[PDB]
Design a binder for these strands. Structure first.
Ligand SMILES: CC[C@H]1CN2CCc3cc(OC)c(OC)cc3[C@@H]2C[C@@H]1C[C@H]1NCCc2cc(OC)c(OC)cc21
Ligand SMILES: [Mg+2]
Ligand SMILES: [Mg+2]
Ligand SMILES: [Mg+2]
Ligand SMILES: [Mg+2]
Ligand SMILES: [Mg+2]
Ligand SMILES: [Zn+2]
Lengths: 139, 217, 96
RNA sequence: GGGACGGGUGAAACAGGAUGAUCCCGCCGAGACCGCCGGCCGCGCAGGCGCCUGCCAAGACCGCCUCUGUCAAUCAAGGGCGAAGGCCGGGGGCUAGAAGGCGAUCAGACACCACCGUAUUCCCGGCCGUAAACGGUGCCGCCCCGCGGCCGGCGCGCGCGU
């Protein structure tokens, strides 16, 4: 890449981005965007690093995807990120999967500085009816 | 079916983003865009979330929203667009045995902006109260709602966007709210939940020029 | 015969109460009969908190928490050991 | 914007993807709903009742050396209200979802699990008049060991605390 194709270097601050984590029960997404969400620098998922469908939310695949993302973004000149940890939400579980902690650790030990952290799970003040009926999943 | 494509990031360049003068730190960061084939217009409108503490190195649970209105000298200028609190603080605010009050009102401005502001209050426990629950009767509740409305009207009935942003950066509105309410009963947490912009004028140049490079202004 | 004086619920001075949904099976349950627990926990678990703080840049940054309310039905609470089946004499104890 | 899977499960497989899907951001539209506070709190004849603002009538209780003077209790016949589902005639059409279809599992599975989905669920006017409509205990009235909690109103005492 040419110098223009990378963030400008200035000692006053460091190149800060934003990382979005989707810690679902079936898959995990690690996504990097600028301060706004209108662009994208690196997008990886745990379904690329495994062959078994049930292992897509497994933490090991999360770590592999995360370190690949680290390689790409460090190539593109990004060192510090903010964290937006999210679950499925929307009349759902509202609890994280098991890939989130793996992603956090993998970022931390990939030489990626950490900024602020917040929860971005979509939650309502109301509720449309969820599936399952009034007797639930009877199995 | 799959095809390879050239790396997008060989035709990209970054631009800086600047904030108004109310804050000590004004460099928000940098934004990439794709080469004109026009960068200026595409990056004309973008909203950046900023934590208040980073703007003013109390301040760690509030964040602002800032939208670009003009690109000049290859750097983007922004003004106020919204204020909100973090989710963990809101979750912490709630405790059983208490009463909750949430009020929202519409407030115009001299510049033509119209804003909706959300206010949240909770009750607390008297120092030597026998009971453990801290609920209150109805007349008290209506008194508190009336006081909230009256104080908000008085301290924000007439205002300008720069003044509003300075007030939000400080906490004088919250201080006035609590002192007005505390004379009624024991309130616990009183503050502004968030601020929204309902409608604004199409053209905002003199306001950006005022907000930016205000320095002494 | 009657097993419990409360009929298995907390319903006093009313006829009907609003309903909720179990979080694991999505069954519909009355609000006064569902089992509720409030939890507070860290977003990052306790083993990596020190690493998170060292990698953080802000000074005095406090770890944000999670505030959630979990609601379970009778069948799912038992299956997940939320409550235990107790003895005849011990059914009258009401402490946590 | 970006470039290869995504969804779903105990595990899978049907439906989605180079017509660029999933993912991030912003905007637009319509219709439902009223959360954490929320409770051995409360209101209502019962069935039942939770967004902001305003309007209309109503009600039990408490306090009173205010008025009347037995005007009361309970009840065949008769009258009114009455969850959900259902029906008639008009509206509207996002979620879920009888019927129906499809993929798994099974000896079989037209069932449990996955996915698509009609009536219905929402509003107005009108029928139906049933529920584990349960405190499985009819209404009015008198006496009755002791301890404790909560709700509303009133009064007393003091060192003035809800
Ligand atoms: C005889 C039908 C049951 C057997 N099958 C196929 C094999 C299988 C394997 C599983 O992992 C070991 C499994 O997860 C528990 C389920 C099955 C199914 C399940 C069939 C029975 C089904 N209904 C009754 C009991 C039961 C209990 C279950 O545990 C929660 C379950 O998993 C969702 C399914 C079932
Ligand atoms: Mg079972
Ligand atoms: Mg029995
Ligand atoms: Mg009932
Ligand atoms: Mg009906
Ligand atoms: Mg009976
Ligand atoms: Zn459940």
């Amino acid at each position: 890449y040419a110098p223009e194709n990378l963030p400008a270097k200035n000692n006053n601050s460091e190149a800060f981005a934003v990382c979005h984590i989707y810690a679902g029960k079936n898959d995990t997404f690690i996504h990097v965007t600028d301060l706004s969400g209108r662009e994208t620098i690196g997008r990886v998922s745990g379904g690329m690093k495994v062959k078994r469908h049930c292992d897509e939310p497994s933490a090991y695949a999360a770590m592999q995807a995360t370190q690949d993302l680290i390689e790409i973004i460090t190539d593109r000149g990004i060192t510090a990120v903010h964290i937006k940890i999210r679950a499925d939400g929307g009349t759902g579980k509202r609890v994280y999967g098991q890939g989130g902690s793996a992603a956090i650790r993998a970022l931390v030990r990939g030489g990626i500085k950490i900024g602020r952290i917040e929860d971005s799970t979509p939650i309502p003040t109301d509720r449309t009816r969820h599936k399952g009926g009034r007797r639930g999943r009877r199995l | 079916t799959q095809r390879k494509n050239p790396d997008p990031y060989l035709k990209k360049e970054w631009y800086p983003v600047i904030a108004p003068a109310h804050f000590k730190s004004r460099h928000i960061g940098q934004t990439p865009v794709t080469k004109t084939a026009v960068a200026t217009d595409v990056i004309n409108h973008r909203v950046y979330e900023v934590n208040l503490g980073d703007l003013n190195p109390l301040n760690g649970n509030t964040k602002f929203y800032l939208q670009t209105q003009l690109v000049s000298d290859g750097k983007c200028l922004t003004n106020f667009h919204g204020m909100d609190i973090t989710r963990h603080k809101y979750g912490s605010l709630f405790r059983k045995g208490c009463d909750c009050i949430d009020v929202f009102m519409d407030i115009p401005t001299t510049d033509g902006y119209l804003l909706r502001v959300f206010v949240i209050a909770f009750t607390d426990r008297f120092r030597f109260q026998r009971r453990k629950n801290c609920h209150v009767k109805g007349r008290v509740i209506r008194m508190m709602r009336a006081g909230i409305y009256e104080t908000l009207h008085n301290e924000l009935g007439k205002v300008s966007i720069p003044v509003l942003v300075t007030k939000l950066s400080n906490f004088e509105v919250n201080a006035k709210l609590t002192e007005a309410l505390q004379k009624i009963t024991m309130c616990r947490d009183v503050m502004i939940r968030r601020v929204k912009v309902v409608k604004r004028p199409r053209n905002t140049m003199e306001l950006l020029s005022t907000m930016h490079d205000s320095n002494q202004v | 015969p009657v097993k419990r004086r409360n009929n298995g619920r907390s319903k006093y001075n009313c006829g009907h109460t609003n309903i909720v949904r179990c979080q694991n099976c999505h069954r519909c349950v009355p609000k006064d009969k569902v089992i509720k627990r409030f939890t507070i926990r860290n977003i990052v678990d306790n083993t990596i908190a020190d690493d998170v703080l060292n990698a953080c840049v802000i000074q005095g940054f406090a770890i944000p928490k999670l505030y959630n309310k979990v609601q379970y039905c009778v069948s799912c609470s038992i299956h997940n050991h939320i409550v235990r089946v107790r003895s005849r004499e011990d059914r009258k104890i009401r402490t946590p």
